[PDB]
Write a protein that binds this ligand. Structure first.
Ligand SMILES: Nc1ncnc2c1ncn2[C@@H]1O[C@H](COP(=O)(O)OP(=O)(O)O)[C@@H](O)[C@H]1O
Ligand SMILES: CCN(CC)C(=O)c1c(NC(=O)c2cccs2)sc2c1C[C@H](C)CC2
Ligand SMILES: [Mg+2]
Length: 331
């Protein structure tokens, strides 16, 4: 057994909000694992709504804080031969993509491997090599990026095929939580010095999918997957063979047509209510990620929220959803 761990990350105010002397309606207390939301009142007299999570990260949280506290422990587990998934869930504009992918610091100040704005995916890839290269491990790394837009499936990493070619999926008859995606490419990442270019290619494929599909970056779900095959020779000369898997899933924005997002919510409702039928089959996303939801994968949710009063209602909606999720048992 193990419950799904759910963490909240509040994003900071941006330029416009900061010059507009915006006041945060959100207070985060990481030590009591608590986010408090100002639901009407004033900064003078106020009703507040409070929520407890597995972790909360306030507006001051940096990319390094998330990597150290959330990602390292999960990566260690994938290195031990486990499957793990991290979802980012939240309204458009609250930092899902920032969290999972990150941005470049302006004016070329950093290399990619040192950029403070690097998110979970590049930091993860960089550390896999940095951990396994030096200790005595023979290992391979494959990555894939399967994205879902309007219940069709796209491979965003494959450098020799166009983005507009949809893929097909079927059930795996060997394993039962399982599906085969015909024609999804697993790209072998030979060393840390091939990481950037692989991701750059996918970036370029993203730009075009965006031209072709309306509000692609908001309405699409992406699943970036890393697989590590490892033959470890222990200092005692014993040879340990293991398979680690990590899914990094950047969900469609949750703001109030998206069958996968609808079904995700229904799948979570079913799992926390222990309704005996769980509607996995009702969308591509919940079929692909069936094992992440009441399955054998260690699963974490980062719910991204905003400090601004404008987003009160959607912030509340994110936190209620995220808060339900805590009750789901995986193994
Ligand atoms: N923790 C953060 N620190 C700095 N900027 C952030 C943070 N979270 C989100 N942002 C900023 O907010 C804007 C939108 O974030 P983005 O990753 O596109 O959100 P989403 O993917 O949820 O729609 C971007 O300008 C991004 O740089
Ligand atoms: C900054 C442009 N890049 C990196 C090429 C990204 O947008 C990006 C990622 N970010 C990054 O790799 C970085 C940010 C800052 C330092 S490294 S991770 C990722 C992509 C795109 C790809 C489709 C899937 C996974
Ligand atoms: Mg985004």
């Amino acid at each position: 057994g193990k419950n799904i761990q759910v963490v909240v990350r509040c994003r900071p105010f941006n330029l416009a909000e900061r010059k507009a002397s915006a006041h945060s309606i959100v207070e985060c207390d990481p030590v009591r694992k608590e986010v408090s939301v100002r639901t009407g009142g004033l900064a003078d007299k106020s009703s507040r709504k409070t929520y407890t999570f597995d972790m909360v990260f306030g507006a001051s949280t940096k990319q390094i804080d998330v990597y150290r506290s959330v990602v390292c422990p999960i990566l260690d587990e994938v290195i031990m031969g486990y499957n793990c998934t991290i979802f980012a869930y939240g309204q458009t504009g609250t930092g899902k993509t920032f969290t999972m992918e990150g941005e470049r610091s302006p004016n070329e100040e950093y290399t990619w491997e040192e950029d403070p704005l690097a998110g979970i995916i590049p930091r993860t890839l960089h550390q896999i090599f940095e951990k396994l290269t030096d200790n005595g491990t023979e290992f391979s790394v494959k990555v894939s990026l399967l994205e879902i837009y309007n219940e069709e499936l796209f491979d965003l990493l494959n450098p020799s095929s166009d983005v507009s070619e949809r893929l097909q999926m079927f059930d795996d008859p060997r394993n039962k939580r399982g599906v085969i995606i015909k024609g999804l490419e697993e790209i072998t990442v030979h060393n840390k010095d091939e990481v950037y270019q692989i991701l750059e290619k996918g970036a370029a494929k993203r730009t075009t999918a965006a031209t072709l599909m309306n509000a692609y970056s908001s309405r699409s779900h992406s699943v970036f997957s890393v697989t590590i095959h490892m033959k470890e020779t222990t200092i005692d000369g014993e040879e340990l063979v293991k398979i680690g898997k990590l899914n990094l899933v950047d969900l469609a924005g949750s703001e109030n047509i998206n069958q996968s997002l609808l079904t995700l919510g229904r799948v979570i409702t079913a799992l926390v209510e222990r309704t005996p039928h769980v509607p996995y089959r009702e969308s591509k996303l919940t079929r692909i990620l069936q094992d992440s939801l009441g399955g054998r994968t260690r699963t974490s949710i980062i719910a991204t929220i905003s400090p601004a009063s404008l987003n009160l209602e959607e912030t509340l909606s994110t936190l209620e959803y995220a808060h339900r999720a805590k009750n789901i048992l995986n193994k």
